Amino acid sequence: NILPDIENEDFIKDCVRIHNKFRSEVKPTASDMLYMTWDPALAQIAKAWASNCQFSHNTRLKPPHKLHPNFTSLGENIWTGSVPIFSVSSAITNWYDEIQDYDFKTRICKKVCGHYTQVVWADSYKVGCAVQFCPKVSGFDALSNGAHFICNYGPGGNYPTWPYKRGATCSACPNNDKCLDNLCVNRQRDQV
Ligand SMILES: [Zn+2]
């Protein structure tokens, strides 16, 4: 298990593909789920924060900070665990599986659900991730020599509302956006 660098093409494909797989398969269906693409600037941001090896959120995701020239606010998911166990698939799946504690009807979360909601946040269409090797991670004293994985999201989600608008798939995309695997695509947005 070697931890990939932020420009590793397989790492990039995994992060994007697996985010989109969960976003495509949501239940209830989403009417407005945007297709998610890689953003190298978001990946650099994740890399810088991840190198701090702290189990807490980047402090500069919101005004008056602005880490990314094109987003007012950024979103963030963090996964921290052992090196052997780490993979893009397991980390993101771990975030998504918080759905078990989420009741879509009422938005009631029984535990921790904010990673799941950011994974499937309709309006978020750019992602960038990084993993760091961390001898110790602050806030997580139990852990030794772990993998510390952070994705940043543009624009940020986790407003006090449903992560997407439930409805017939792709029935409420922006403009005249086409649909690909239950996601709203758009040549302009999706350019990397
Ligand atoms: Zn969190």
Side-chain angles (χ1 to χ4, degrees):
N1 212 33
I2 202 155
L3 305 181
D5 69 281
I6 63 168
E7 291 178 352
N8 172 316
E9 292 174 359
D10 296 320
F11 178 65
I12 295 176
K13 287 167 187 180
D14 290 338
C15 286
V16 176
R17 171 190 87 246
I18 294 166
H19 274 98
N20 282 325
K21 186 193 70 71
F22 288 119
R23 298 166 65 82
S24 285
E25 296 174 354
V26 291
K27 293 306 158 44
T29 53
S31 68
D32 62 342
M33 188 78 68
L34 305 189
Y35 187 91
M36 192 160 268
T37 52
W38 189 260
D39 184 326
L42 290 179
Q44 287 174 293
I45 290 159
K47 174 181 155 192
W49 182 250
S51 78
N52 284 327
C53 290
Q54 289 180 33
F55 196 68
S56 70
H57 283 308
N58 193 322
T59 62
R60 307 189 289 168
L61 305 173
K62 290 170 152 172
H65 309 280
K66 190 173 168 168
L67 296 175
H68 192 296
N70 301 334
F71 305 106
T72 299
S73 305
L74 290 186
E76 188 171 84
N77 288 334
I78 296 185
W79 182 96
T80 303
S82 69
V83 173
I85 254 289
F86 166 78
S87 69
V88 170
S89 178
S90 302
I92 304 178
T93 298
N94 176 267
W95 296 337
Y96 178 86
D97 284 347
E98 299 179 340
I99 191 177
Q100 299 181 5
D101 297 316
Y102 190 78
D103 180 40
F104 201 93
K105 181 202 200 312
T106 61
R107 296 200 303 111
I108 287 165
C109 176
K110 288 201 319 272
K111 212 189 202 85
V112 180
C113 304
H115 309 109
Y116 152 72
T117 59
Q118 176 67 86
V119 163
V120 304
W121 202 264
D123 288 341
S124 297
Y125 65 91
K126 287 293 176 189
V127 64
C129 309
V131 55
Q132 301 289 358
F133 174 74
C134 288
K136 306 300 289 180
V137 176
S138 315
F140 211 153
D141 292 337
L143 190 77
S144 172
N145 298 321
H148 189 52
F149 180 61
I150 305 205
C151 294
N152 289 116
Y153 297 82
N158 287 8
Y159 291 95
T161 187
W162 292 277
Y164 56 87
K165 303 198 300 245
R166 67 183 298 157
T169 285
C170 278
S171 69
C173 295
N175 325 317
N176 346 123
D177 282 7
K178 263 73 172 202
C179 184
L180 174 69
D181 296 316
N182 306 336
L183 308 170
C184 307
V185 292
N186 178 272
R187 299 255 275 86
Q188 189 94 50
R189 278 196 316 271
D190 311 332
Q191 63 188 348
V192 177

